[PDB]
Every structure is written in C-alpha cells, then in structure tokens.
Amino acid sequence: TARLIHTSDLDQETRDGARRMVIEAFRDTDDFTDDDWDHALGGMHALISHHGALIAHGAVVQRRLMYRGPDGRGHALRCGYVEAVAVREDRRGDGLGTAVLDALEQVIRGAYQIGALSASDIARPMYIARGWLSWEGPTSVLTPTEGIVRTPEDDRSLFVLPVDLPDGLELDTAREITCDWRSGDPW
Amino acid sequence: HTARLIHTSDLDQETRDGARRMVIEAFRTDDFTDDDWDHALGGMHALISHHGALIAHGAVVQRRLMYRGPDGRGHALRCGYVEAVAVREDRRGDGLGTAVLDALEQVIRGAYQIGALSASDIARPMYIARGWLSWEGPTSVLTPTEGIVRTPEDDRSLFVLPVDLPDGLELDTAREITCDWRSGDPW
Ligand SMILES: CC(C)(COP(=O)(O)OP(=O)(O)OC[C@H]1O[C@@H](n2cnc3c(N)ncnc32)[C@H](O)[C@@H]1OP(=O)(O)O)[C@@H](O)C(=O)NCCC(=O)NCCS
Ligand SMILES: CC(C)(COP(=O)(O)OP(=O)(O)OC[C@H]1O[C@@H](n2cnc3c(N)ncnc32)[C@H](O)[C@@H]1OP(=O)(O)O)[C@@H](O)C(=O)NCCC(=O)NCCS
Ligand SMILES: NC[C@@H]1O[C@H](O[C@H]2[C@@H](O)[C@H](O[C@@H]3[C@@H](O)[C@H](N)C[C@H](N)[C@H]3O[C@H]3O[C@H](CO)[C@@H](O)[C@H](O)[C@H]3N)O[C@@H]2CO)[C@H](N)[C@@H](O)[C@@H]1O
Ligand SMILES: NC[C@@H]1O[C@H](O[C@H]2[C@@H](O)[C@H](O[C@@H]3[C@@H](O)[C@H](N)C[C@H](N)[C@H]3O[C@H]3O[C@H](CO)[C@@H](O)[C@H](O)[C@H]3N)O[C@@H]2CO)[C@H](N)[C@@H](O)[C@@H]1O
Ligand SMILES: [Ca+2]
Ligand SMILES: [Ca+2]
Ligand SMILES: [Ca+2]
C-alpha cells in the first residue's frame, strides 16, 4: 500500500506532514532531532496516506559501510540505510510498518549491496522476523580527525540485509563493521 | 530533449545493461571500470532514448563531503554526486548533455545541500557554463587506515553546486574539501 518517492519529488506539505508525523511517532527532550531528519533525506521515501493524512513513512538513503574480510582485503559496501520508520500511533499493529519495509526492501534489493539500520530496542523483533541479521561484532565509525572509533552503544542495535555482496564475500557478523561519518548519530 | 528520471531500483534489467553498455562506449583497461559503474548506482538516473536505444545517461548518488568553515566547525554536507554523464558519439552538441544535467540538477536542488563531480576535460565547458564552481583549494579523501589523504590529481577536476548550505556556511573554494571513502576513484 506504500508509495515510493525520491526526496527530490516531495512537495513542501508532504515533507512537513512526514516530519511532523515522524517526530510525534518517536515521542513515548525531543527524541527525533534535526540531525535525525537530515539522515532521512536524499533517498526514497515509502509513504502511506489515508484521507489526506500521512499515517506511515520510511526512508532508505545511500551510504558506505566498511568491512575487512579475513583475506585482509577491505570493502566499502554500497549500503541502503533505513531511517525514520514510523506509523501514526492509532494506526499501529495493522500491517502498515510491514508495508513500509516491503517497499524499502524493494529499493534495497534493486539498488544496493547491503541494507543496514540501527533499530530502536523495541522494533528489534520486527526486523529479526523479516530476515534482517543482527550484528554480533563491534561497531565503529570512520571519523575525520580521529580514525575508526568504537560505537559500543550501537553494537546491540545494528541490523544488516546482505542482498548483493561483491566478489565471493560472505559477511562474518562477529567481525568489526564501520560506518561512514555524518553529524548526529553515526548509526 | 527531456530526460526521464528513474531510481536504480526501478530500472528493468535490459535498461540497466543498456545504460552500462552506452556509458562504457561513450568513455571509450577500459576507461570506465567496474568501480566506475558501482559509483553510478544507488541514486537517480537521467535517461534519453531514441529509435529504441539509449543516447544519453547520467546519475546522481548520495555521499558526504567534509568541509571546515573559518569558525572551525566541521560540516558533513549531504552531497548529490554526479556520475557517468554520457551522450552517444553521433548525438553530441545537440544539447543532450544539457538535458541530462537539467534533470540531475532538479534532483540536487530538490534533495541535497551541495552537488559535486570530478569532470573529464571535454565536459569542463558544459559545467562552467551551467554555473558550477571550479574548486581552487586542495582536495582529499577520508581513508579508513591513513586519515585524510591529499588527492592532488583531482584538484583541477572538482566542480561543486552549493544549493542549500547549513546556517553560517560560506563556501570558500580556496579551502580544503574532503570526500568520504569508496573503492576506485574517490572523486
Ligand atoms: C515500529 C512501527 C513502525 C511498527 O509499525 P506497525 O504498523 O505497528 O507494524 P505492523 O502492524 O506492520 O507490524 C510490525 C511487526 O511488529 C510486530 N507487531 C505486532 N503487532 C504490533 C503492533 N500493534 N505494533 C507494533 N508491532 C507489532 C509483529 O512482528 C509485526 O509483524 P506482522 O505484520 O507480521 O504482525 C511503529 O510501531 C512505530 O512507528 N513505532 C514508533 C517509532 C519507531 O520506533 N519506529 C522505527 C524503529 S527502528
Ligand atoms: C556528455 C558529453 C557528450 C557532452 O554532451 P553533449 O551532448 O556534447 O553536450 P551538449 O550539446 O548538451 O552541450 C555541451 C556543451 O558544449 C559547449 N559547446 C556548445 N557548442 C560548442 C562548440 N561549437 N564548441 C565547443 N563547445 C561547445 C556548451 O557549453 C554546451 O552546452 P550547451 O549546448 O547547453 O550550451 C561529453 O561530455 C561526452 O559524452 N564525452 C564522453 C563521456 C564523458 O566524458 N562524460 C564526462 C562527464 S564528466
Ligand atoms: N522517551 C522514549 C525514548 O525512546 C527511545 O527510542 C529509541 C530511538 O529514539 C533510538 O533508536 C536508535 C538507537 O537505539 C540507536 N542506538 C541509534 C539510532 N540512530 C536510533 O535510530 C532510531 O531512532 C532515531 C530517532 O531517535 C531515528 O532517527 C532512526 O532512524 C531510528 N532507526 O534510540 C532509542 C533506543 O534506545 C529510547 N528507547 C529512549 O530514549 C526512550 O525510551
Ligand atoms: N587523459 C585525458 C583524457 O581523459 C579522458 O578521460 C577522463 C575520464 O575518464 C576521467 O575523468 C575523471 C578524472 O579526471 C578524475 N580525476 C577522477 C574522476 N572519477 C573521473 O570521472 C569521470 O570519468 C569516470 C570514468 O572513468 C566516470 O566514472 C565519472 O563519472 C566521470 N565524471 O579520467 C580521465 C581524465 O580526465 C578521456 N579518456 C580522453 O578524453 C583523454 O584520455
Ligand atoms: Ca534521536
Ligand atoms: Ca575510469
Ligand atoms: Ca572487465
């Protein structure tokens, strides 16, 4: 039931409608920040509206995830990173979230080497059920002034969906995995 | 000439193979490598067709460009990076290149803070004409194991299109600009 739209083609009221719905959906200090919204921009949005109202949203945005295999090689994987997955609270538990992820996984499978996200510890079983793989190793970020810095807080949160890895590569989820730099939450 | 815009994930197999075949030839060790094709995926494609065959391609993919302002604050700018802009040999100088860049710039203005690209020499006038800023400072890449490494080869090639810079950001082309890491040509 989800409509796929590039940030590009969102009119002002859809952007404001989506942002307002996502900010409210992540309230149980505003949990969903300006940086969190920046992270949701530049890729494909999955939207579900009912009678003029936005009731569901998700985004998949491109970045690189860094992974070194046991042959020592080093890979910068073309990643579809899942952001701002949200359903208006009264509309939850009726398959809308599923419909949003169904549409984002179509993007990921069609365009990227790997899907990734850092799930709220509440949503973790929903991803595990879709066949997303929990990372077991240490997580880190490639910083511009320090080098690769550990992100222990994101170790339990990181999920991957390896859709089309290069060469022979099969990930070992016990190895380290490193995200590229951005402001706010790196994961 | 009007380009149609399509996400990587919506390309049918024949159009994907068609685009890569046309782009490899337009750039003709082949000059257009497997990494070069990798770099053109994950974003929006501009396509122009004629007599059932592709005559023009380009792509805009999301990455981060790192820039430090005169107030010492580091920015990780949401970048629409332009890749694989190509017009079939027999169709050059009819404005097809212009139509491709018009559609990609629609994406960049609609979704990103900055546009960037590392132009071949033959393409340079086309960018200078469209009002892309030539960079005058040193360029670098953020590497995983060596920190920020100068990319002197790319100093003369870099164009940016600054469309929606964060508050308090004066883009000075004399200063250093750093791309995020990827395999192959970092720029
Ligand atoms: C997480 C969220 C998007 C789920 O959306 P939803 O429309 O309730 O979910 P669905 O009905 O499609 O179900 C998602 C899965 O969660 C579980 N689930 C079952 N009932 C549920 C309910 N009422 N609410 C949430 N999850 C439920 C099931 O495993 C379900 O899979 P199913 O469709 O096979 O039953 C939504 O609750 C939300 O917006 N939460 C707050 C913001 C947030 O945490 N989202 C992103 C975290 S990474
Ligand atoms: C993309 C490419 C075909 C240029 O496309 P094109 O169809 O020749 O370009 P257009 O006709 O749209 O315009 C090219 C520009 O050349 C310039 N130009 C126009 N007439 C010219 C002339 N007589 N002499 C020289 N330059 C001229 C103009 O700036 C023109 O833009 P405009 O027509 O909007 O004014 C060329 O870059 C290419 O395909 N080469 C191989 C692949 C490649 O190197 N691409 C690199 C992208 S970085
Ligand atoms: N008052 C409600 C709050 O909800 C919060 O909900 C969760 C989310 O806000 C956030 O979830 C993860 C986080 O686990 C992980 N370590 C970092 C990751 N970037 C966050 O990401 C998630 O939430 C943010 C919005 O905050 C979204 O931008 C992002 O797309 C989404 N996947 O962190 C929280 C998980 O600890 C918290 N559980 C807690 O602060 C509190 O219960
Ligand atoms: N060597 C001079 C000329 O190089 C041309 O080819 C150029 C392009 O192939 C390539 O241009 C730039 C490059 O300058 C810069 N330092 C790095 C950047 N990634 C390259 O990028 C460009 O070409 C590659 C394809 O190779 C594309 O994938 C990319 O999208 C495109 N903008 O590098 C070459 C140097 O400018 C032509 N083969 C020919 O006119 C002539 O040989
Ligand atoms: Ca947050
Ligand atoms: Ca090349
Ligand atoms: Ca080959």
Author numbering:
A (entry chain B): 17 to 44, 52 to 210
B (entry chain A): 16 to 43, 52 to 210
Sentences from the study reporting this entry:
Three different classes of enzymes are well established: ATP-dependent phosphotransferases (O-phosphorylation, APH), ATP-dependent nucleotidyltransferases (O-nucleotidylation, ANT), and acetyl coenzyme A (CoA)-dependent N-acetyl-transferases (N-acetylation, AAC). Here, we present the crystal structures of an AAC(2′) from M. smegmatis [AAC(2′)-Id] in its apo-form and AAC(2′)-Id complexed with CoA and different aminoglycosides (gentamicin, sisomicin, neomycin, and paromomycin). Collectively, the kinetic results indicate that AAC(2′)-Id has a very broad substrate-binding specificity, similar to AAC(2′)-Ic9. AAC(2′)-Id was not active on streptomycin because the antibiotic does not contain 2′ amino groups in its chemical structure, indicating that AAC(2′)-Id exhibits strict regioselectivity.
The chemical structures of both neomycin and paromomycin contain a different linkage at ring II and an additional hexose sugar ring (ring IV) compared with those of gentamicin and sisomicin. Paromomycin has a hydroxyl group at position 6′ of ring I, whereas neomycin bears an amino group at the corresponding position. In contrast, the 6′-hydroxyl group of ring I of paromomycin exhibits calcium ion-mediated interactions with Asp54 and Asp59. Compared to neomycin, paromomycin forms different interaction networks at the positions of oxygen atom of C61, leading to metal ion (calcium)-mediated interactions with the enzyme. This interaction may explain the higher binding affinity of paromomycin than neomycin in our activity assay. Paromomycin has the same chemical structure as neomycin, except that an oxygen atom is linked to C61 of paromomycin, while a nitrogen atom is linked to C61 of neomycin. The nitrogen atom linked to C61 of neomycin makes direct hydrogen bonds with the side chain OD2 of Asp59 and the backbone carbonyl group of Asp54 residue, whereas the oxygen atom linked to C61 of paromomycin forms metal ion interaction. This difference in interaction might explain why AAC(2′)-Id has ten times higher catalytic efficiency for paromomycin than for neomycin. In the case of paromomycin, rings I and II make multiple interactions with AAC(2′)-Id, while rings III and IV exhibit only a few interactions with the enzyme. However, three ring-containing aminoglycosides (4,6-disubstituted aminoglycosides: gentamicin and sisomicin) bind toward the β8–β9 loop region and make several interactions with this loop, whereas four ring-containing aminoglycosides (4,5-disubstituted aminoglycosides: neomycin and paromomycin) bind toward the α1–α2 loop region and make several interactions with it.
